[PDB]
Design a binder for this molecule. Structure first.
Ligand code: ATP
Ligand code: ATP
Ligand code: ATP
Ligand code: ATP
Ligand code: ADP
Ligand code: MG
Ligand code: MG
Lengths: 266, 266
């Protein structure tokens, strides 16, 4: 498996219909789940080093259509970290107070502190996604917002916040099956809403604006297009992406001023 | 396994030396962990109902000496919940801004919203624990702070915030072994701190101030004294305490405004 094949290279426009939704890297589900469990132990150790060092941060941004696995990826993969070192924000419809500020005001508030992992389940990119499809903003505004988003990510990068953006890529048939499973389950009815159907009738428009959003992929702030039809494969790929980032960040335990083997506990 | 025997009944003062630190209810680690795994599924389901209902909240407060298992309890038990529905705060030494306010200002800010589980890893009780042992405040101030804490918990209860306070109870010998394991393990040296030895020399003074703090136990805002020398037993007992609270709160899925069998997904 080469996860760099899922990275959007800078300057290369994405045509999503040419990107796989259903990869398995030749692995069975059981092999994939076992590898994910092993990576979870490494994710925990590297995140503990990140916290103890207190010099850098990691920001994971998740965007995806409804039912494409944002909630599941956070549970399964972000669940590998110590929850004391993680701040997860699920960005919903802007409140009245948030709308009275610039669109990055509420986003910047949640940028992670030194030593922490930040996770945006939805993010600044919502302001150039649904808002474009339903004509809440026009193209001129959307282009300007994408520029402001690039500048914001450059600001965080220079603050030693390592940025990873992940689009979970599922097929329309797979989304239909997952949405049907919500309708069928009385304990999941509360998660099906009329907007689900409206967004499906705008599937191709959403492709267009997601492909515009993916143009912010840079070497410092990459987008990944993760094939997510197989939930276990989504979790495996995301685990690799996050572990590669942490290993590259290479946090170190701080120096200590004593010899641990000589400490006497009474 | 009668969890209510660990509850501090109102007005019944605790003498911690008479409470066991190392119960196992006749279970092994394998047996206890299998029960905890089955309770985790039930915790996830009841927390999803709490969130979907959006009317009530759950607040878990943890206090314990260093190495007594706050971090582990949060990972193992709170990890059963969907992290999208949980807010964990690890309260550290008050900042200059926090000290310029009353002691409950920073605590009140983190009280949970409707639909959420809040976890205070340390809490308002720190202001009547370490502060008393080292004479940062006197008895008169400490008694007044305990009254304000009582009043604060009453305010949250009346807001349908279900309060559970948990003291993790370990023996001095157990703490010594766990601290030694930090000294012995290169990946854990960073968690050994000079305060560890100073507080041990003040073990009995801390018993006194914890027993005073435990007097805020009420039917509405109970303290539990959990035998925590066995880490798996700590997790089993805490799982029961939280599941009992959620089942009693009895959150209901909300009514929906459509017929799921009549929805047609194209
Ligand atoms: N800046 C924004 N402008 C408009 N809508 C936004 C913005 N940020 C988030 N939203 C919307 O808020 C809603 C949150 O809905 P909810 O928490 O119920 O999840 P959801 O419907 O399952 O979302 P998703 O479609 O991403 O899976 C989503 O429809 C999302 O598109
Ligand atoms: N158990 C839960 N506790 C708290 N919030 C939850 C829970 N289940 C779902 N939610 C929230 O309800 C909304 C709808 O859930 P949904 O399953 O669509 O999640 P999601 O994060 O949008 O993922 P997906 O990409 O699969 O749609 C989201 O805002 C999610 O955060
Ligand atoms: N209100 C408060 N006043 C003074 N000290 C406080 C207060 N709240 C928290 N603290 C202290 O902040 C410190 C946080 O330290 P740290 O995060 O390293 O954890 P720790 O040393 O493992 O804590 P613990 O002894 O609770 O296990 C603790 O020593 C705690 O007692
Ligand atoms: N992997 C981690 N990521 C983030 N914060 C961590 C991590 N490990 C420990 N911490 C924090 O560092 C401090 C010391 O850790 P420690 O293991 O003593 O935890 P704790 O919550 O105090 O538990 P205990 O009751 O066992 O002392 C605490 O503030 C803890 O929350
Ligand atoms: N698990 C326990 N371990 C040790 N002592 C306890 C425990 N539970 C209660 N006690 C002590 O026993 C005495 C009476 O407790 P109480 O809560 O009235 O018992 P119950 O309600 O079960 O009859 C008090 O001194 C109390 O501190
Ligand atoms: Mg969704
Ligand atoms: Mg500690």
């Amino acid at each position: 498996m080469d996860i760099d094949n899922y990275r959007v290279k800078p300057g290369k426009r994405v045509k999503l219909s040419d990107w796989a939704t259903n990869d398995d890297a030749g692995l069975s589900k059981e092999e994939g789940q076992a590898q994910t469990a092993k990576l979870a132990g490494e994710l925990a150790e590297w995140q503990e080093r990140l916290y103890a060092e207190g010099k850098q941060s990691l920001l994971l941004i998740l965007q995806a259509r409804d039912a494409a696995g944002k909630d599941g990826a956070v549970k399964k993969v972000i669940g590998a970290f110590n929850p004391a070192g993680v701040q997860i924000t699920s960005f919903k419809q802007p409140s009245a107070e948030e709308l009275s500020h610039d669109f990055l005001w509420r986003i910047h508030q949640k940028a992670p502190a030194k030593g922490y992992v930040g996770v945006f389940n939805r993010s600044q990119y919502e302001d150039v996604l649904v808002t474009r499809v339903y004509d809440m903003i026009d193209d001129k505004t959307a282009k300007r917002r994408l520029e402001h988003i690039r500048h914001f990510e450059e600001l965080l990068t220079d603050n030693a916040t390592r940025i990873v953006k992940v689009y979970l890529h599922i097929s329309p048939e797979e989304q239909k099956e997952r949405l049907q499973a919500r309708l069928d389950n009385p304990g999941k009815h509360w998660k099906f809403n009329p907007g689900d159907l409206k967004d499906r009738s705008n599937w191709d428009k959403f492709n267009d604006v997601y492909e515009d959003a993916l143009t912010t992929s840079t070497d410092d702030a990459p987008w990944y297009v993760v094939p997510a039809d197989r939930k276990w494969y989504r979790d495996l790929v995301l685990s690799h992406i996050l572990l590669g980032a942490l290993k590259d960040m290479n946090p170190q335990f701080p120096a200590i001023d004593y010899d641990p083997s000589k400490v006497v506990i009474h």
